[PDB]
Design a protein around this ligand. Structure first.
Ligand SMILES: [Zn+2]
Ligand SMILES: [Zn+2]
Length: 123
């Protein structure tokens, strides 16, 4: 096996290399671009905090979910449990180094001060 530069999670929708920009969440088996993260029936874009359903090809929003599955699906309960929905995860930049090379060569003590407010949102 020969090594490759970049990412191994290509966009199964547009068949393009997911690198540098990407800014997407990790899906079940296949990874897709943010711009490519649109509905298969409405072609609309999804936002963080909303629940999405992954169809045979692309993502299908709750707006056309019933009518879409009704035409290309039907009836049939065969398999091993199926009825879960996932929320669109926030984008995480691949450009982030988290290492401690300075504390491994030289040992130094430092004092840090942080202020916390504490409080949750309801409305
Ligand atoms: Zn793509
Ligand atoms: Zn839709």
């Amino acid at each position: 096996y020969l090594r490759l530069f970049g990412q191994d999670g290509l966009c199964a929708s547009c068949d393009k290399r997911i690198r540098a920009y990407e800014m997407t969440m990790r899906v079940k088996d296949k990874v897709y671009h943010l711009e490519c993260f649109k509905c298969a029936a409405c072609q609309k874009h999804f936002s963080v905090g909303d629940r999405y359903l992954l169809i045979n090809s692309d993502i299908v929003c709750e707006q056309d979910i019933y009518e879409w599955t009704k035409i290309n699906g039907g009836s049939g309960g065969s398999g091993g449990s199926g009825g879960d929905v996932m929320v669109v995860g926030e984008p995480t930049l691949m450009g982030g180094e988290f290492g401690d090379e300075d504390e491994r060569l030289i040992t130094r003590l430092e004092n840090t001060q942080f202020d916390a407010a504490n409080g949750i949102d309801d409305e």
